[PDB]
Amino acid sequence: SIIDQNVQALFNEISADAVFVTYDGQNIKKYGTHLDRAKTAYIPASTFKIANALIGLENHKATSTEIFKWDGKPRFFKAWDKDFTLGEAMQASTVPVYQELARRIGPSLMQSELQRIGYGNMQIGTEVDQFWLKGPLTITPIQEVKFVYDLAQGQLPFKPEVQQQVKEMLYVERRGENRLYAKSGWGMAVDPQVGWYVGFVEKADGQVVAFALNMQMKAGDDIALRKQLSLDVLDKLGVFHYL
Ligand SMILES: *C(=O)[C@H]([C@@H](C)O)[C@@]1(C)CC(S[C@@H]2CN[C@H](C(=O)N(C)C)C2)=C(C(=O)O)N1
C-alpha cells in the first residue's frame, strides 16, 4: 500500500545496502534497498549481548544486581572506565563487561547453550570472548527478529525471570503505553562492516512487533543513523508513532 511506499521512500535516500525486517508472530515483512540481506548471515556484534546476558543469568554466572567492577585498565572507549551492572552495560554497550561474562560462561557451556537454543550458526571458534565480534558466529536478520520476538513473549527456552530481566535491560522509551525495546550493534572487525538495530515494540494491546535493521556500514558513518532510521520506519508503519 501507500505505507509500504512511504517506508521504501525512506530508504531511497540511504545509499548503503540495508534491510529492515518486521515480525508480528505471524508474518515476516521486509523493506529497504537490498532485501536479500534479510536471509544473509552476519556477525551479531553487540546484539549478541542479549543472548550473552540470558545464558549468563540462566547458568548462575551473574545476576542483574552484581557490579562488574572496572579493573583499572583503560578500555578502547573512555566512558567504559567505570563499574557496571549487566543492565547498565547493556545500555552503554560495554563490551569488556560482556567479554568477562563470556569468560565466566566458558567455551564448553557457551557452545552447548547456543546449540540448545539454536542461535544463528551456533559456531564459537576457539576464543570465547571474541566469536560474536569477529566470527565465526553469524545470524540472519530474520533469525534475530524471531529471537527477540520470543524474548518479548517470554518464550525463549530460559527461565521467565531471566527473560524478564534481560528484556528490561533493552528498554528504550515508551509512548503512551507502547514500549520500545532495542539494541544497536556495529561490527567493525569484519569486512564489510555490519550495522544492526534490533528490538521490538510492545503495545498496550500486548501484541508485539519485533524488528531488525541490518545494513552495511563503513568508517565515518553517522552512529545515530541506525536508530533514527528505524524509528522513522516504525512511525511510517504505524507500529510506533512519533508523539
Ligand atoms: C557492538 O556491536 C559494537 C562493538 C564494540 O562490539 C559497539 C558497542 C561499538 C559501537 S559505536 C563505536 C564505539 N564508540 C564510538 C563512538 O561512539 N564514537 C562517536 C567515536 C563508535 C556500537 C554502536 O552500535 O554504535 N556498537
From Swiss-Prot:
PTM comment: the record says: Carboxylated on the epsilon-amino group of a lysine, with the resulting carbamate functional group serving as a general base. Probably N-carboxylated at Lys-49 at neutral pH in vivo and undergoes complete N-decarboxylation, at pH 4.1, in vitro. N-carboxylation at Lys-49 probably increases catalytic activity under physiological conditions.
Entry EC number(s): 3.5.2.6
Membrane topology field: Lipid-anchor
Instruction: Describe what happens upon changing F76Y.
Output: Similar catalytic efficiency to wild-type with respect to penicillins, oxacillin and imipenem
Stimuli inducing this protein: Expressed from an upstream promoter, P(Aba2), in an insertion sequence, ISAba2. Expression level is positively correlated with gene copy-number in clinical isolates.
- Its top-level enzyme class, in one word, is hydrolase
Subunit structure, briefly?
A: Monomer. Dimer.
- Explain the purpose of this protein: Class D beta-lactamase which confers resistance to the beta-lactam antibiotics, including penicillins and oxacillin, and moderate resistance to carbapenems such as imipenem; in the DH10B strain of E.coli. Acts via hydrolysis of the beta-lactam ring. Has benzylpenicillin-, oxacillin-, cephalothin- and imipenem-hydrolyzing activities.
Question: What is the protein name stated in its UniProt record?
Answer: Beta-lactamase OXA-58
Say which species the protein is native to: Acinetobacter baumannii
Top-level taxonomy: Bacteria, Pseudomonadati, Pseudomonadota, Gammaproteobacteria, Moraxellales
